[PDB]
Design an enzyme around this catalytic site. Structure first.
Site, PDB file in Angstrom:
ATOM      1  N   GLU A   1       0.840  -1.229   0.000  1.00 41.73           N
ATOM      2  CA  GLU A   1       0.000   0.000   0.000  1.00 41.73           C
ATOM      3  C   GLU A   1       0.886   1.297   0.000  1.00 41.73           C
ATOM      4  OE1 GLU A   1      -0.683   2.923   2.423  1.00 41.73           O
ATOM      5  OE2 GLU A   1      -0.333   1.330   3.943  1.00 41.73           O
TER       6      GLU A   1
ATOM      7  N   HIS B   1     -10.757   4.306   1.693  1.00 41.50           N
ATOM      8  CA  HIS B   1      -9.905   3.595   2.621  1.00 41.50           C
ATOM      9  C   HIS B   1     -10.137   2.085   2.534  1.00 41.50           C
ATOM     10  CE1 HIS B   1      -8.357   2.321   6.570  1.00 41.50           C
ATOM     11  NE2 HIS B   1      -7.510   3.315   6.377  1.00 41.50           N
TER      12      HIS B   1
ATOM     13  N   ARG C   1      -5.502   5.738  -1.503  1.00 43.04           N
ATOM     14  CA  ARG C   1      -4.342   4.832  -1.529  1.00 43.04           C
ATOM     15  C   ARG C   1      -4.245   4.193  -2.910  1.00 43.04           C
ATOM     16  NH1 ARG C   1      -4.711   6.956   2.758  1.00 43.04           N
ATOM     17  NH2 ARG C   1      -4.688   5.975   4.806  1.00 43.04           N
TER      18      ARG C   1
ATOM     19  N   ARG D   1      -3.277  10.961   6.838  1.00 39.61           N
ATOM     20  CA  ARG D   1      -2.988  10.393   5.497  1.00 39.61           C
ATOM     21  C   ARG D   1      -4.254  10.251   4.635  1.00 39.61           C
ATOM     22  NH1 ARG D   1      -0.799   5.347   3.977  1.00 39.61           N
ATOM     23  NH2 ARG D   1      -1.630   4.510   5.937  1.00 39.61           N
TER      24      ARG D   1
END
Ligand SMILES: Nc1nc2c(ncn2[C@@H]2O[C@H](CO)[C@@H](OP(=O)(O)O)[C@H]2O)c(=O)[nH]1
Length: 96
Positions: free
Chosen positions: A54, A85, A69, A65
């Protein structure tokens, strides 16, 4: 399961940045970038442990963050984007 293919040009620009870092082998803005993604919920294809990794996709203005991703798989061009997420993933098409 994977939700579909999305052109790289259709994702936030920071997705492009992360893929560039992934190609140059960083360095990355977060120490957590590059850890194993376990695929525990089986949303992605079943693979051995360590097949997925990731990387953060920076969220402009976030203190954390956030939720974006990039998941890479070991295969050529296998990279998935998630904006929620790890709830949903789209395969990234770098050719468009
Ligand atoms: N939902 C989910 N999160 C995972 C899995 N493997 C690793 N992670 C998450 O990936 C990140 C790096 O280990 C952590 O979340 P984070 O992105 O919020 O820090 C951790 O929760 C998985 O299979 N499912």
């Amino acid at each position: 399961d994977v939700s579909g293919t999305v052109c790289l040009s259709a994702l936030p620009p920071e997705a492009t940045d992360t893929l560039n870092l992934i190609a140059s082998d960083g360095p990355f803005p977060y120490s957590q970038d590059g850890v194993v993604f376990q695929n525990r919920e089986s949303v992605l294809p079943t693979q051995s442990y360590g097949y997925y990794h990731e990387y953060t996709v920076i969220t402009p203005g976030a203190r954390t963050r956030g939720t974006r991703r990039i998941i890479c798989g070991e295969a050529t061009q296998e990279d998935y984007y998630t904006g929620d997420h790890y709830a949903t993933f789209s395969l990234i098409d770098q050719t468009c």
